[PDB]
């Protein structure tokens, strides 16, 4: 079974490449599909990835994920921050 987009906007890693999930999966994800979302470590100010997989028509987004806000122009999206070591 197939999953609907779990979020509105996010850059994720799909098969090694960064894509906008809303663009690359504009028509849903297929079973087995796997992406990595980006989350922030706000103490070390670096980003880390958390994988999420479409399993029987459901894809659970990691709890640390935060949706992009166009209004928050002073905030850096997790994907744009230096990666955690």
Numbering used by the authors: 243 to 327
What does the paper behind this entry write?
Beta2-glycoprotein I (β2GPI) is the major target for autoimmune antibodies associated with antiphospholipid syndrome (APS), an autoimmune disease characterized clinically by thrombosis and recurrent pregnancy loss. The binding sites for anionic phospholipids, lipoprotein receptors (including ApoER2) and GPIb are in domain V of β2GPI (β2GPI-DV). Circular β2GPI can be converted to an extended form by altering pH and salt concentrations, binding to a high-affinity antibody directed to domain I or by the binding to cardiolipin. Anti-β2GPI antibodies create multivalent β2GPI/anti-β2GPI complexes that have pathological properties compared to pathologically inactive β2GPI monomers, which are normally present in plasma.
There are no glycosylation sites in β2GPI that could affect function of domain V indicating that the individual domain V (β2GPI-DV) dissected from the full-length β2GPI will function as domain V in the extended form of β2GPI. Also, the residues in the loop are either weak or missing from the NMR spectrum of β2GPI-DV in solution reflecting its internal flexibility. The structural similarity between β2GPI-DV and domain V in the full-length β2GPI provides convincing evidence that the isolated recombinant β2GPI-DV mimics domain V in the extended form of β2GPI. The concentration of A1 at half-maximal inhibition was 176±37 µM for β2GPI in serum and 188±44 µM for domain V. This observation demonstrates that A1 binds circular and extended β2GPI with the same affinity suggesting that the binding site for A1 is not obscured in the circular form of β2GPI.
